[PDB]
Amino acid sequence: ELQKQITKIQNFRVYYRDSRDPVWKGPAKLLWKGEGAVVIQDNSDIKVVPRRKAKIIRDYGKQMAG
Amino acid sequence: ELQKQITKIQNFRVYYRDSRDPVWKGPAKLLWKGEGAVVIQDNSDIKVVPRRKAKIIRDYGKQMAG
Amino acid sequence: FLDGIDKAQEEHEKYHSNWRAMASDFNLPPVVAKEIVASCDKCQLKGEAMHGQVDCSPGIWQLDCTHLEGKVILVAVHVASGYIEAEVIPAETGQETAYFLLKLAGRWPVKTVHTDNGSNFTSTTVKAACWWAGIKQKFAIPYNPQSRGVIESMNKELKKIIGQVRDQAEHLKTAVQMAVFIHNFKRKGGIGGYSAGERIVDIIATDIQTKELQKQITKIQNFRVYYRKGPAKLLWKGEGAVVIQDNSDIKVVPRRKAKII
Amino acid sequence: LDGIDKAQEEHEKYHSNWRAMASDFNLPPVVAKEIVASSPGIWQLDCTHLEGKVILVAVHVASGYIEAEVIPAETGQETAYFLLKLAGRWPVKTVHTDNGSNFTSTTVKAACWWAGIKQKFGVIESMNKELKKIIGQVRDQAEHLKTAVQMAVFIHNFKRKGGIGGYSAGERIVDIIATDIQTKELQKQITKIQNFRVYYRWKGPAKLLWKGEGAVVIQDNSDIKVVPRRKAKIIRD
Amino acid sequence: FLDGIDKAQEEHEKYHSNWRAMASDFNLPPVVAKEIVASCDKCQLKGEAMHGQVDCSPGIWQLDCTHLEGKVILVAVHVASGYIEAEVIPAETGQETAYFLLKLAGRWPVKTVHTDNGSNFTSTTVKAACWWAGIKQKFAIPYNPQSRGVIESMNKELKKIIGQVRDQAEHLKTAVQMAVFIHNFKRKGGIGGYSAGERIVDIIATDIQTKELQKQITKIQNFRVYYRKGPAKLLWKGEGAVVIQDNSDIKVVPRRKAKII
Amino acid sequence: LDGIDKAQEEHEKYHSNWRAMASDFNLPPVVAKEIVASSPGIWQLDCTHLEGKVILVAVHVASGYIEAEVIPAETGQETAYFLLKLAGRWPVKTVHTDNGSNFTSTTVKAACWWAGIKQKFGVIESMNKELKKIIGQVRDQAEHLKTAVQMAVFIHNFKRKGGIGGYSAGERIVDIIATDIQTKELQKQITKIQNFRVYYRWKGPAKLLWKGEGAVVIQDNSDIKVVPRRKAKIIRD
Amino acid sequence: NFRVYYRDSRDPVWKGPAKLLWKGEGAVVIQDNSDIKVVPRRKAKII
Amino acid sequence: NFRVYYRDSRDPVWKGPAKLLWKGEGAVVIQDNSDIKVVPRRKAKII
DNA sequence: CGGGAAAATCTCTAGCA
DNA sequence: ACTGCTAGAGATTTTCCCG
DNA sequence: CGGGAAAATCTCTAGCA
DNA sequence: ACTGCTAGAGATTTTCCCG
Ligand SMILES: C[C@@H]1CCO[C@H]2Cn3cc(C(=O)NCc4ccc(F)cc4F)c(=O)c(O)c3C(=O)N12
Ligand SMILES: C[C@@H]1CCO[C@H]2Cn3cc(C(=O)NCc4ccc(F)cc4F)c(=O)c(O)c3C(=O)N12
Ligand SMILES: [Mg+2]
Ligand SMILES: [Mg+2]
Ligand SMILES: [Mg+2]
Ligand SMILES: [Mg+2]
Ligand SMILES: [Zn+2]
Ligand SMILES: [Zn+2]
């Protein structure tokens, strides 16, 4: 049910940048996806990233690797 | 005598760069000045720097400040 | 510093010495010397040393024209993935651009296009094409190519590949399509080690899937959260922190001093 | 790791595939592929005619997604260029043509050789009918037939929701290609691991299935046995 | 990988896929995929991402010409200090350059000049001027301005100052000399917070003083040092390390396993 | 810190200056300046004549270092441009001219006002004689008199070693200007510190001389007393 | 308020002072003599 | 030995392979078809 | 030992054309 | 065998001042 | 726990014209 | 109210493999 859905959302990865660092910050965990912002979880930490700074993939290689 | 001369040499400062870092490394201590190289002493450490990478000043502001 | 300040402004009107030279030569604290510099219109000659960041939402495409061997190559890139669409067009005109764009909108989901201010892109016919397809147009600041940085870099990459495979074709149009193939499917890197084709598939598939998933979650998970305020809708809870939305302002407040109803 | 037996029992009862067995019971997909083990690149081409012009139409058969455009003439070169464009835009493994002169020329064949497309000489007809219907609905919103053709392609790919899950052809083709990428990645993982030989506790040669961070899954005598990493010695044969 | 290697070279001849795409699509270790890339002449299109470092010895001067309002400004910079010498010259000719250079050699110690390959600098008359003054000429790699980076940056700085003080003069020659004044004495920064004039004075004074000092030290301090070898002349000793010179090779060996005689 | 009394005794015996007292006895130079306390920017200009041309010659009087060149004509503008060049190349505080028309023009005065040079209307003559002697020695190595003038300037500044320490005019001028920079820096330090007032152990107002890292030097009742930093309270008056 | 000095639109000469209307990341909107301009922050200085 | 590929002297086309003769910091000396060239290391690739 | 405020240091950009 | 740099704007980190 | 070797990551450049 | 980026070459750091 709702737990399965939430874990599914949490399988997706988020690459993101901060407002002054041009390096794309490595794969984080997707907690919530909105119209204007996504809420991620990067190394025991909950950031709010705007949508225009966020690349959300599933990464099929890692999904198939388990 | 020789001790006074050596301390005098050691009053001079050396700005220098390493072969792959473009930042000029901060004020070091001049131990020896040769034709092809100068021997410096930067933070309890003895490096040999080529002359073309070494700016040697006395820095009159600091000399006057003591 | 009253005496020193008057001498330093007199001297700055002639020489425009920087703040250090004034602070040194007239006994002034750095803040006063810097103020004398900052009051001179003639010394405001340098911008702040940063770079902005272009929009990378799933629906943004950056368009540009480029030129090779006398022909005009119209290039689009999907910003999120690096996936390119390019065609040799007969001229740099709004008619060919509107056609390229309407094709692109029929091929992939396009929400926004981002171009420089070339006449082909600001044409009324391109505007009518965007209005029919539902595409929002965004025009960069004039003469700031850094704003189109993604597509300009894709220009460089596409020309490099065309130069690698030019001898395998006759007409430039064929070599361009070959290079588009090579970029989209035969070069892997970036975030998920993907090719651009794989990556765009993943980006768009993820967009659709997450949209549906969160639709179902919000449809099920309905609660209200108080913290410190009012009935702030709940987004996510877990690991000692709660994510909530109070008047379109998403804030992460810890579990303590936050109750869910 | 512990739900492997549950997965085997589920496959014996219901014959579920590896996707459900790996998503419900939490298994590295190579494990589910072993349990179960113990199109997306096919396009249909065809030229069609309208207002005296030729409309070359490509159909991804698995999704119903269309790539159509007006070409100047029905020659080999035009078809081959359309094919290079299609292949550079999508994963194209196989094309289904109708023995027409353009579809058999030396240039189209050379382009399929360059792109690595296989050529093999009903859905195309019905899709052409749908395309001509939309082209008729929107011919008045445009002056040239090429613009109307692209408008119709847009309407068909993103504005016509049908099928079971109420999706457009674009959503469907994206889903199908994503599935195919998953398939290719799983096959690469299997091909990687299939060259290893394992010896555990020391028993006979066993087949490696996964080298997790806390366990090692193998398969001996058609039996999937989980063992620690220190208790097993992986080699390469 | 015998089967995989043959398929990957066949595919690379068509597409020129990078090493990752091959490693992924044909089961190859990264080293073999990278070798296939590194064997293709057609894929060698990028240099190593570094920058060299220009010579900054006390005697090096970097010369260049620059252009403003239709006139030719000949600019020299002392590399160690940032001190500039600039004059408006009537044309970009070897005769005016030789004259500027001979003046400079009479004003300051010049050992080496470093220029691009403009015709004024490679002229025979400039060569005769350098030979009379004892100046060694060094010519950068053609069309590599980064080699003249110091003087090119000084061009930018001098033009910026000229633009700040242009309205205080009539002829460009006067504004150029004003800007040279402003750069040499009214702008402080760099290593010792100096101006360029102060800094060049310090650099040259230090050169002379250290030369004499070490002359006297080596004249007094005469010893021989063995370590591990032969009679290596002694340079400096102290703080548990000894500095020595064994066959023109200066090495810092610790006090242990090093004896002075 | 402990050699301050030694410095006072040395100044009483020998009247040494602050340089020796600060280098031999190790004192922040403001301390030695207090003990002792209890030209380098002057240039001579003059136009000279040769082969019908005018040679404008500047002499740094303290060192004997020459800046000479052929000018087209003896006008104010030419002299003023020579002066702007000289001032942008060296620290020029004062120029000593000979009331000639060029040396008194409104343009030369405006240039000295812009550069911050003071104008005041034997060494110049002797130096001109030396310059003409070298110009004669090297007139044959050149075609134009301007090249020979610059050759002679080079020979005079770097190839003629004389004086006590066997130096050239260039070495001398560099030494003198370095000394002057030291002087300016010491004066800036003194001006900085002269605005502070100190109270130590709490005694009366004392004058600050140095705020070292381990001690604080002050001067009370014409007596230089060293105290710790915690034992004193610096303020600003 | 704020003084804005800027270099716009290929003219390498720096203009201003202008009034700041909006400050984003990467760009500002300035008001210089009734003209609204949009300038990258690389090409402006806000005082 | 070494293969050297280089871009020289304003020609944006990459040439080579050439033989490496000398390797400094910042530059190399190559030998391409009897021609000695001097190239910045930003503009070469040594294999 | 503690913050605050000021200095020092570090990061990063355009223009040199 | 030769070689990017310089100075300023803003951010971040270290140092000094009085408790 | 220890090195070695291989992978991953980080740093940094030109060209986009 | 908008905004540098991308991919490759080489260097450095982390991870995995068998003892
Ligand atoms: C007439 C249209 C509209 C108005 O402006 C002009 C001129 N222009 C100039 C460049 C250019 O200078 N590229 C080099 C570059 C420099 C920095 C960077 F970050 C990215 C870069 F690509 C273009 O690429 C380009 O497309 C145009 C163009 O189209 N137009
Ligand atoms: C005919 C002579 C000899 C042969 O080459 C040409 C052409 N050239 C071109 C530039 C130039 O492109 N500057 C921009 C730049 C770019 C990068 C960088 F690191 C430094 C920079 F200054 C010059 O400055 C220059 O003096 C010349 C010149 O003199 N010549
Ligand atoms: Mg453009
Ligand atoms: Mg462009
Ligand atoms: Mg030049
Ligand atoms: Mg130049
Ligand atoms: Zn100013
Ligand atoms: Zn290749």
Q: How far is D188 from chain A (nearest CA, A)?
A: 9
The span from the CA of E174 to the CA of E155, in Å, is: 17
- Residue owning tokens 């692209």: D150
The span from the CA of D70 to the CA of D114, in Å, is: 24
- Residue owning tokens 């150029």: E176
From chain E, pick out residues whose CB is under 8 angstroms from the CB of H17.
41, 44
Is D46 marked as a binding-site residue?
Answer: yes
Touching pair C, A by Cβ (3+ pairs < 8 Å):
yes
CB contact under 8 A, F182 and B65: no
Q: Which ligand is nearest to the CA of C165?
A: 8
Range of G2's domain?
1-47
E245 CB under 6 A from ligand 2? Answer: no
Q: CA angle, C182 as apex, C180 and C185 as ends, to 5°?
A: 100
Helix ranges restricted to H, chain F: 4-14, 18-24, 29-37, 76-89, 106-115, 123-138, 145-158, 169-193
CA of B13 to C1' of J1 (A): 32
DSSP chain D: -TTHHHHHHHHHHH---HHHHHHHTT--HHHHHHHHH--TTEEEEEEEEETTEEEEEEEETTTTEEEEEEESS-SHHHHHHHHHHHHHHS---EEE----SGGGSHHHHHHHHHHT-EEE--HHHHHHHHHHHHHHHHGGG-SSHHHHHHHHHHHHHHS--BTTTTB-HHHHHHHHHHHHHHHHHHHHHHHHHTTEEEEE---S-EEEEE--SS-EEEEETTEEEEE-STTEEEEE-
CA E74 from centroid of its chain's CA atoms: 19
- Nearest chain B residue to F180 by CA: give it: B60
The span from the CA of F89 to the CA of F83, in Å, is: 10
Partners of residue E225 on adjacent β-strands:
E232, E260
- Residue owning tokens 């005065």: F109
DSSP D68-123: EEEESS-SHHHHHHHHHHHHHHS---EEE----SGGGSHHHHHHHHHHT-EEE--H
* Nearest nucleotide (CA of C49 to C1'): I13
- Residue owning tokens 């599914």: A8
Q: What residues contact G33, with CB distance under 8 A and at least 6 apart? A: G18
Residues 177-216 of D with CB under 7 A from strand L: 211, 213
Which tokens belong to B2? 């020789």
Of D139, D208, D191, D176, the C-alpha closest to D63 is D176
Coil, helix or strand at residue E213: helix
Question: Count of CB atoms within 10 A of residue F138's CB?
Answer: 18
Q: How far is H34 from chain E (nearest CA, A)?
A: 19
E143 touches strand J (CB under 7 A): no
Number of compact structural domains in chain A:
1
The span from the CA of E227 to the CA of E244, in Å, is: 9
Coil, helix or strand at residue C107: helix
Partners of residue D235 on adjacent β-strands:
D197
- Is-contact F169 F211, C-beta < 8 A? no
CA of F90 to C1' of L13 (A): 52
CB contact under 8 A, E106 and F175: no
Radius of gyration (C-alpha) of chain E in whole angstroms: 27
Number of compact structural domains in chain G:
1
C145 CB under 6 A from ligand 1? Answer: yes
The span from the CA of E20 to the CA of C8, in Å, is: 62
- Is-contact H2 H19, C-beta < 8 A? yes
- Nearest chain G residue to C147 by CA: give it: G40
Range of B25's domain?
11-57
The span from the CA of E79 to the CA of E21, in Å, is: 47
Coil, helix or strand at residue C181: helix
From chain F, pick out residues whose CB is under 8 angstroms from the CB of C27.
188, 191-192
The span from the CA of E246 to the CA of F1, in Å, is: 42
- Is-contact C138 G27, C-beta < 8 A? no
Counted residue by residue, chain H has a size of: 47
E45 touches strand K (CB under 7 A): no
Coil, helix or strand at residue F174: helix
C140 touches strand L (CB under 7 A): yes
E45 touches strand L (CB under 7 A): yes
C164 CB under 6 A from ligand 1? Answer: no
Q: How far is C185 from chain D (nearest CA, A)?
A: 7
